[PDB]
């Protein structure tokens with residue numbers, strides 16, 4: 119279900135593997151922003167969701183540093199996986215950049231991503 | 236540095252190790268909500284931040300499922316390590332609960348936690 | 353342009369008048385939550401947006417109290433208006449409920465609504 | 470108890486009057502950002518809050534355009550008034566800037582301000 123290759127609305131690619139333990143591991147490639155090639159991701163998901171048609175809560179983090187460049191930022195996605203013919207992962211994210219103390223009021227962007235297979 | 240035992244304004248406890256690879260691993264114990272005992276966390280951080288006075292960007296995730304309890308929820312903290320006169324982690328977070336499609340509009344809480352050692 | 357009747361993805365109805373002052377006034381009707389009938393809204397908008405084809409910044413508030421009921425809550429929508437053939441208002445919102453101090457950590461939901469005519 | 474002159478952690482100044490209907494009217498002056506002098510604000514508040522110790526839900530908007538400047542941006546504050554010894558208004562905010570479609574993913578900042586009398 120959650121494991122596989124997903125794409126959002128900006129065209130970024132989320133490649134993820136959901137493990138026994140509730141662990142998420144894989145790779146993120148952004149189509150936008152100060153980003154090039156793939157980045158490591160890690161996260162967690164609820165490995166025993168409610169049985170009432172509820173979705174599956176999950177979240178993951180990407181620090182946008184790889185061998186090619188470093189944006190000095192990290193993003194976390196919070197959302198849920200909804201399985202089925204039209205499987206989706208619906209999220210909201212927070213992108214925090216390293217700022218000085220004086221600019222910290224402006225260090226965090228908020229947005230929402232929708233991923234489909 | 237980031238490795239260590241941190242507490243937030245609620246009294247929750249964040250125990251982390253920062254790997255040289257940009258990995259964050261540890262446990263989280265919440266003082267509030269539908270939680271008891273400790274939860275695995277996993278995250279990422281900028282392992283080569285700027286030194287221009289800027290903080291260190293980081294994020295992590297906790298799914299609130301352990302051997303004791305399952306809240307069917309996942310929270311992500313996005314923020315930055317500030318190495319001022321005091322060690323501090325300022326974050327904003329997103330908590331998403333598993334919900335049916337009907338209730339998805341009301342699935343996600345947002346807040347802000349500050350951590351000191 | 354902004355002035356008109358708008359509907360979001362949940363089926364809520366936003367009727368507003370954009371004033372010369374940069375004032376937004378109207379009524380809001382939610383299809384979801386603890387709400388019946390129309391509610392008073394007020395907001396503001398950039399009455400002189402960039403000419404580069406950027407959208408128009410705006411926001412508005414609704415306290416969910418009227419003669420029918422009082423949810424002891426208030427939402428604020430923050431976003432931009434984009435004109436043309438398929439004019440749209442894309443927003444993110446914050447919904448804060450009155451709580452005790454002990455429960456302030458869970459007082460605020462976050463979401464996103466997209467409005468069309 | 471909401472009416473009056475408030476200051477936040479950044480040094481911004483917030484002058485409000487709460488109307489009986491449940492209106493919020495006033496001016497806002499920002500210590501930071503692409504801002505100078507006063508800005509009209511407007512908003513709503515729960516004029517009939519619970520009487521169990523809960524705060525009063527409120528919200529307000531500021532479009533950062535005035536005689537002096539236009540940032541092509543709007544901020545909304547959502548949160549609650551905690552009355553008593555140290556009157557507080559705890560908020561979270563969304564700041565949206567007019568952008569083109571291409572940059573829309575990065576148009577919104579999120580933050581939180583604490584105001585005191």
Ligand SMILES: O=C(O)CCCC[C@@H]1SC[C@@H]2NC(=O)N[C@@H]21
Nearest residue numbers: 247265267268269299306308310
């Ligand atoms: O009630 C649940 O669903 C478990 C949530 C755990 C508590 C939340 S996570 C964000 C915030 N920071 C904390 O230390 N506790 C709350």
Ligand SMILES: O=C(O)CCCC[C@@H]1SC[C@@H]2NC(=O)N[C@@H]21
Nearest residue numbers: 364382385386387416423425427
């Ligand atoms: O339940 C309440 O506290 C009052 C109803 C709030 C409904 C919310 S406001 C954000 C979202 N957009 C809508 O059109 N309805 C919901």
Ligand SMILES: O=C(O)CCCC[C@@H]1SC[C@@H]2NC(=O)N[C@@H]21
Nearest residue numbers: 481499502503504533540542544
């Ligand atoms: O720079 C702009 O686009 C306009 C000024 C922005 C000031 C922001 S609004 C949120 C935060 N709280 C404040 O008191 N000031 C900043």
Ligand SMILES: O=C(O)CCCC[C@H]1SC[C@@H]2NC(=O)N[C@@H]21
Nearest residue numbers: 130148151152153182189191193
């Ligand atoms: O700081 C940067 O510019 C690098 C990261 C790129 C931004 C992101 S993360 C949220 C959004 N979703 C997505 O696929 N790309 C952008």
